Amino acid sequence: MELTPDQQTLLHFIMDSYNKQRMPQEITNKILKEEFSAEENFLILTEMATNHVQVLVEFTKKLPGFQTLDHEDQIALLKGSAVEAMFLRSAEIFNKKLGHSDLLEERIRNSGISDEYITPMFSFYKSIGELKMTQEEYALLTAIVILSPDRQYIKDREAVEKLQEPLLDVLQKLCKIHQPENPQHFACLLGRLTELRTFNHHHAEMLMSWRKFTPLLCEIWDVQ
Amino acid sequence: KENALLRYLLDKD
Ligand SMILES: CC(C)(C)c1ccc(C(=O)Nc2ccccc2C(=O)Nc2ccc(C(=O)O)cc2)cc1
């Protein structure tokens, strides 16, 4: 259908905050021209992960109605969404980087991370590509992931639900406009989130194989 | 306290 005036306001707010996304030229130049080693590659990944969290915190705080929620809840939502948001955000790097991806992919495959973890996540990046999601879709999807009622340790789940549902309605409308031909597009995006949820177990296993780590990463990931 | 860094970042600006 067509977005309501309130819905239009919500999308722009999400769009403005999301498009503040940054990739320090410093991180970009490391992947392209840097010591190609398992140790060096792992370090680059950590820097990117740390950078994402800083971006993620800014996007999360700016989220409409996020400031309303309980302070414990805000941390709980932020802690809950970190792995899923990071993988989705990393997935979005088909549009953003072009040469670099081959280097980035190789560095990721040589990080010393086990092969089993690599296949599913890369499959996800390839799988996510099929959707050919717009930037607006990525922003709405990330916000929905962040604003999850289901997250552990939430004192007031219902309050989180109200914020999340408006996003879903907006995202659903976007699918029709962006992809009028496919009526199953909204369902497909939701399905990916289910595939996204898998990574927390996968991410948790990766953590267990010690390799480093940044102070910000440790708090969010509950390291030690 | 626990999660001081996250709270500080959240309460930023
Ligand atoms: C070696 C071990 C498995 C313990 C490991 C290796 C790398 C890391 C890490 O810092 N990042 C990743 C590790 C494994 C698989 C994927 C990643 C990853 O995608 N990091 C990442 C997150 C967000 C962004 C971004 O959106 O800017 C970029 C990279 C953590 C643990």
In Å, how far are A24, A116, A189 from A2, measured between CA atoms? 37, 43, 19
Picking from A141, A137, A143, A126, the residue whose alpha carbon sits closest to that of residue A178 is: A137
Distances (CA, A) of A194 to A80, A119, A191: 14, 17, 5
For residue A61, give the nearest of B3, B5, B10 by CB distance: B10
Residue A181 carries which DSSP code?
Answer: S
Does the CA dihedral A19-A85-A102-A134 come out positive or negative? negative
Residues of B in contact with A74 (CB under 8 A): 10
> A41 burial class (0-12, 13-18, 19+ CB within 10 angstroms)?
buried
Going by C-alpha positions, the residue among A143, A40, A39 that lies closest to residue A89 is A143
What is the gyration radius of the CA atoms in chain A, in angstroms? 18
Whether ligand 1 lies within 6 angstroms of the CB of A90 is answered as: yes
Interface test with chain B among A74, A79, A81, A218, by most B beta carbons within 10 Å: A74
Which A residues, 149 through 208, put their C-beta within 8 Å of a C-beta on chain B? none
Contact: A75, B6; criterion CB under 8 Å: yes
Q: Is the Cβ–Cβ distance between A210 and A121 less than 8 Å?
A: no
Collect all residues of chain A within an 8 Å Cβ-Cβ radius of residue B7: 71, 75
Yes or no: say if A22 and A55 are a contact pair by the CB < 8 Å rule. Answer: yes
**Is A18 part of any known ligand binding site?**
no
* Residues A140 and A174: beta-carbon distance below 8 Å: yes
- Nearest-10 Cα torsion for A193, A99, A22, A8: -50
Provide the CA A149 distance to its chain's centre, in angstroms. Answer: 17
Tokens 């909204």 belong to A186
Domains of chain A, earliest start first: 1-224 (1.10.565.10)
Q: How was this structure determined?
A: X-ray
Distance in angstroms (rounded) separating the CA atoms of residues B13 and B9: 9
Instruction: Tell me the two tokens of residue A224.
Output: 């030690």
At what resolution in Å was this solved? 2.6
Give the distance from CA A146 to its chain's centroid: 9
CB A85 near ligand 1, within 6 Å: no
Among A63, A58, A5, A11, residue whose Cα is nearest residue A178: A11
Measured distance CA(A75)–CA(A152) in Å, rounded? 11
Does any CB of chain A come closer than 8 Å to the CB of residue B5?
Answer: yes
First to last CA, chain B: 21
With b for 16 or more beta-carbon neighbours within 10 A and e for fewer, the A134-171 pattern comes to: eebbbbbbbbbbbbbbebeebeeeebbeebbebbbebb
The closest alpha carbon to A212, from A3, A47, A37, belongs to A47
B7/A71 touch (CB, cutoff 8 Å), yes or no: yes
3-state secondary structure (DSSP) of residue A17: helix
Please report how many Cα atoms fall inside a 13 Å half-sphere around the Cα of residue A70, on the Cβ side: 12
How far apart CA A121 and CA A164 sit, in angstroms, is: 25
Residues in chain A: 224
Picking from B10, B8, B6, the residue whose alpha carbon sits closest to that of residue A216 is: B6
